[PDB]
Design a protein around this ligand. Structure first.
Ligand SMILES: CC(=O)Nc1nc2ccc(Cl)cc2s1
Length: 342
């Protein structure tokens, strides 16, 4: 019957009530978020006199331990910011309340998935996509800081939030799936639509998997639709191949899961296994983006900053983000120097 003296539910989530007042400080307004970790609530902090977002972790050793790993990375990041110029969500403090670890974040506005939805999945402009792209690239540069070397490991539109609904400043949230660069412990990582080829191929990975995810995200922000909407891993890889061609032989020769997707011919060349799909490399990004045809579905014809020349810069940057080879794939520092950002 009763769990944690009536405070927790079946899933070990704290049962939130509007109007409750924790620690004579936080006035709970409403539930704004939910996930495997627990819940997120909007609350007014009476001491600092501002709204905050409190992430209430479930009352279970597994989720507690995961969330203390998130706390450690956040404090490590926020210790190399202070001025907050690098677009990571800011952890203010944490405390235990009725056996739930609570992380107090600055309160943010809508996420980029909500934006897509608000466009009816037709996308936002190239100008706004540039602004998100610039900030995300600066965030990834920050994460690559040697003493950090953090992989967010689950970048996707819903994990990118606007600071303010009338402005274009963004913050990355949810470092619960994140770890630093080390020996490979985990293999089933990233969200499928944004999952890198190295990961699909069971290969070793580094910070470059975040850059792959970013390429995918940026095209989606402009088209309204995911670049690669795989219903499973095989379909995911096939959708990547349609656009980018068969992965290079030197990669696939080292891939433990090569044969999940491809097959080695007697001459050492690799083709797709049949299971539907356009031939490899024939769903070109140039055409997906509508470089010469007025953008996605022609919806940006005549709009300023949407000329052929503007689109070719965007296209060229994304292809450098979607490089098959993680060692050749563009890095944050050089991405910021791309002509797309002039
Ligand atoms: C949901 C909303 O309108 N604002 C939000 N703001 C935040 C800030 C931190 C975290 Cl982890 C989640 C959220 S959700």
């Amino acid at each position: 019957k009763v769990y944690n003296d009536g405070y927790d539910d079946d899933n070990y989530d704290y049962i939130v009530k509007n109007g409750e007042k924790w620690m004579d400080r936080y006035e709970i307004d409403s539930l704004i978020g939910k996930g495997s970790f627990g819940q997120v609530v909007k609350a007014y902090d009476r001491v600092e006199q501002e709204w905050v977002a409190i992430k209430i972790i479930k009352n279970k050793k597994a989720f507690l331990n995961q969330a203390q790993i998130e706390v450690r990375l956040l404090e490590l990041m926020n210790k190399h910011d202070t001025e907050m110029k690098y677009y990571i969500v800011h952890l203010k403090r944490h405390f235990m309340f009725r056996n739930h670890l609570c992380l107090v974040f600055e309160m943010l506005s809508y996420n980029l998935y909500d934006l897509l939805r608000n466009t009816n999945f037709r996308g936002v402009s190239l100008n706004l996509t540039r602004k998100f792209a610039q900030q995300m690239c600066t965030a990834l540069l920050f994460l690559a800081t040697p003493e950090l070397s953090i992989i967010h490991c689950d970048l996707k539109p819903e994990n990118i939030l606007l600071c303010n609904p009338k402005r274009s400043a963004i913050k990355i949230v949810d470092f619960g799936s994140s770890c630093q660069l080390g020996q490979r412990i985990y293999q089933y990582i990233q969200s499928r639509f944004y999952r890198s080829p190295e990961v699909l191929l069971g290969m070793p990975y580094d910070l470059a998997i975040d850059m792959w995810s970013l390429g995918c995200i940026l095209v989606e922000m402009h088209t309204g639709e995911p670049l690669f909407s795989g219903a499973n891993e095989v379909d995911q890889m096939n959708k990547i191949v349609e656009v980018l061609g068969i992965p290079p032989a030197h990669i696939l020769d080292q891939a433990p899961k090569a044969r999940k997707f491809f097959e080695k011919l007697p001459d050492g060349t690799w083709n797709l296994k049949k299971t539907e799909y356009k031939p490899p490399g024939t769903r070109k990004l140039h055409n997906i983006l509508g470089v010469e045809t007025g953008g996605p579905g022609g919806r940006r014809a005549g709009e300023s900053g949407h000329t052929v020349a503007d689109y070719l810069k965007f296209k060229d940057l994304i292809l450098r983000m979607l490089d098959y080879d993680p060692k050749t794939r563009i890095q944050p520092y050089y991405a910021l120097q791309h002509s797309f950002f002039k």
